[PDB]
Symmetry: C3
Subunit: 241 residues, 3 copies
């Protein structure tokens, strides 16, 4: 028989701690917070890093593992597969005709990008993203196009953007190099501007208040088709602030 007083005092501390964990979750997997923005706001001193969150609440078994930037409050959700190998992915029955073709939708062994990490169910994560968009004022994502004999953005020969690749946003919105300036991506470095027989890369960013457009789920290069034209991707996380 357990000593009664110590048992009661132990239950009391445990009940008190259970209530505290409801009020102030620590962002562990058993005890996930709502967003990184909430963690930051409520815990000024906590360090940037990995935390679990459950923005759609209810049952917490669908919580997602994310990086919180505690300087900015950003919640960053990683694609399930950050890295797409660098190789030839497509040969057209017509080398000379350069046209946009979707990696995920039309290329042998292509896939549309998924988010959350290898354990997750995408339908659950889609619900989580919906709540994250609701709890943020903007979102941003970066993607790197790795290139060998493949223009990504600016064509050095012509000086124009007509061979630039297309991105597919999350709600059937294309994001482009040109056009309406609220649907256009920006480019920080562009090492793909000519065919050199060597590898370069172009780094592309989209930031918007219309967070329904992110993340990116597909990429359509144009300057592809000939058999020595190779590319690959590093897909960054979609970050909500």
């Amino acid at each position: 028989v357990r000593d009664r007083d110590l048992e009661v005092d132990t239950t009391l501390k445990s009940l008190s701690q259970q209530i505290e964990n409801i009020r102030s979750p620590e962002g562990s997997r058993k005890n996930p917070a709502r967003t990184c923005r909430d963690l930051k706001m409520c815990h000024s001193d906590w360090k940037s890093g990995e935390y679990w969150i459950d923005p759609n609440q209810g049952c917490n078994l669908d919580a997602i593992k994310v990086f919180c930037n505690m300087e900015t409050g950003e919640t960053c959700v990683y694609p399930t597969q950050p890295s797409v190998a660098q190789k030839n992915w497509y040969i057209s029955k017509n080398p000379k005709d350069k046209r946009h073709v979707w990696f995920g939708e039309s290329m042998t062994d292509g896939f549309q990008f998924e988010y959350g990490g290898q354990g997750s169910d995408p339908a659950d994560v889609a619900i989580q993203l919906t709540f994250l968009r609701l709890m943020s004022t903007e979102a941003s994502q970066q993607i790197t196009y790795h290139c060998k004999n493949s223009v990504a953005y600016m064509d050095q020969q012509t000086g124009n953007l007509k061979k630039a690749l297309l991105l597919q946003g999350s709600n059937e919105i294309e994001i482009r190099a040109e056009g309406n300036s609220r649907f256009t991506y920006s480019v920080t470095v562009d090492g793909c501007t000519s065919h050199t027989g060597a590898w370069g890369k172009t780094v592309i960013e989209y930031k918007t208040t219309k967070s329904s457009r992110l993340p990116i789920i597909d990429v359509a290069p144009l300057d592809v088709g000939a058999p020595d034209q190779e590319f690959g991707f590093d897909v960054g996380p979609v970050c909500f602030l």
Copy 2:
């Protein structure tokens, strides 16, 4: 003895906390959605539960059918059964005007959901939240007909006399045309005028869950005094 009052309180506090972390789906402790109940209690089975998708005060919680195989929350119409009779006499046998039951017929009404004496405005907020917490929705509706084509016309072999449906965000769902705004038909017993009762069963299923539930129906083959219809309106189910 006498102070196991304390053990009772401790057990009750512990249970109140558990009901918060993981609601049982009772009226007192409603869960958020059937999806959450299935997720948190994998051994629980299909049937009626109380949910509160919009949280806050729990007094506007709604009683639903949870399909615990799929995770669907199924929200019933307040009046599933609509009487079978002549609802409409036109100045005509121009039996080829769509006329809304709810917006236009005498004693017609647009369909409400939630059951009990739910307040429809509370329930609209709940449906708003169920849409956020699901990826698709579907709904079935039965058209009972007496001398009234529903979908296919045996005479002409075509759909030009098909009824149309109104969705929740005012979208019109039709027999033909764009694949996205199109309803399907499982059984079609309304194809000719025979003096007897028949029925036609219709489904719509979509990822644009704003379009559901159905709030109105506009038959076309109505107007003469010998033409009668009714409905069974199924639940709107969110997955």
Copy 3:
């Protein structure tokens, strides 16, 4: 002995659990919306409460007026009162052009809400949630006018000089046109140039609540140095 200790701790735990299930709407224990407060505590009085519709951490709670007769949550502009003076001088008698106070006039600014020293980005997220939990929203604005038509022009009897409103959604709200996007007026003392102050009181009410609150105003009948105006901006109210 020290059952004083134990029963005091049991009470405190029972209370903290209560505060989570039924927040009181204080700054430390904010409720979700006024609607929820009314629903759960029908005896509570209209007044100032703190709410946190977006939940998570509660430090971004906003202070609101709850109308406990209606269930309305009213969120006040940070600066309800905009001074009455000449704000804009054109190269004019043209005319007769809409000029946005916020986007275009010197010293003009778009309207922020939440007050205290809230962060507009935080309040915008709260309004997103307020909109999800409400069926309807309204707001009233007063245009104080000296030699400036706001709505009806008495020399013409037309609304062609009526000011424009900018809603939160972008979305212009206008005197005329499609009826879902028009404002109404309950007072119009601006119909002629008298050299004295008058005012026009405008209201917009909609189920499409992402159009509210109003964030900017474009008068048309401005541009000369003798033309002056100011605003009293009402709360945006949600139900």
